[PDB]
């Protein structure tokens, strides 16, 4: 399968499917195989990569959808990240 590398501010390298990362219009532009994020730390970027998986799993499904969890500590930084990524 096709994968892409998303790199956080602190050097962490998250390797996810290209389909999943294209969810974010910002990442699509940043590509059109690796994308460095100067402002998104790893504890935020891992939740983003989790959200992609979550969103691709539960879109178009009549199975009960669970709540996508966000710890209070990371809510601001994740808000700012999603607002930048548009996902």
């Amino acid at each position: 399968m096709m994968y892409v590398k998303l790199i956080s501010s602190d050097g962490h390298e998250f390797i996810v499917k290209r389909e999943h990362a294209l969810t974010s219009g910002t990442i699509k532009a940043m590509l059109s195989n690796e994308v460095n994020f100067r402002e998104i730390p790893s504890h935020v970027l891992s939740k983003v990569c989790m959200y992609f998986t979550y969103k691709v799993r539960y879109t178009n499904s009549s199975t009960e959808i669970p709540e996508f969890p966000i710890a209070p500590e990371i809510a601001l930084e994740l808000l700012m990240a999603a607002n930048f990524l548009d996902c």
């Binding site: 390797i15 996810v16 790893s42 891992s46 990569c49 989790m50 992609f52 710890a71 809510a75 601001l76």
Partner: protein, 104 residues
């Protein structure tokens, strides 16, 4: 049943899925396709436990209800530099800041 995984080695962190019925060796083939290292140079862990190639992910505790998309289960990975295997090393994620006054 699909299980959702973070395969982790140093600062690398793969996000992927596999069947509960699929083997540890089959997951190593997935790592081969992405990180370009063959199964013999790989070593998959659950916490401090080395996993066996012929065992299923379900038998190694990765179930469809623990390894969820929104909260996937971690699988340690360790490579062999020529002669012997490196120790399992997973770099932790960054620390979040203090909760601002307004969020308490």
């Amino acid at each position: 049943m699909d299980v959702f995984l973070m395969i982790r080695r140093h600062k690398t962190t793969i996000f992927t899925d596999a069947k509960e019925s699929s083997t540890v060796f089959e997951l190593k083939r997935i790592v081969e396709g992405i990180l370009k290292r063959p199964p013999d140079e790989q070593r998959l862990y659950k916490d401090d436990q080395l996993l066996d190639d012929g065992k299923t992910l379900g038998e190694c505790g990765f179930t469809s209800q623990t390894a969820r998309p929104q909260a996937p289960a971690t699988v340690g990975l360790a490579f062999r530099a020529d002669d012997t295997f490196e120790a399992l090393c997973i770099e932790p994620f960054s620390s979040p800041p203090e909760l601002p006054d307004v969020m308490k």
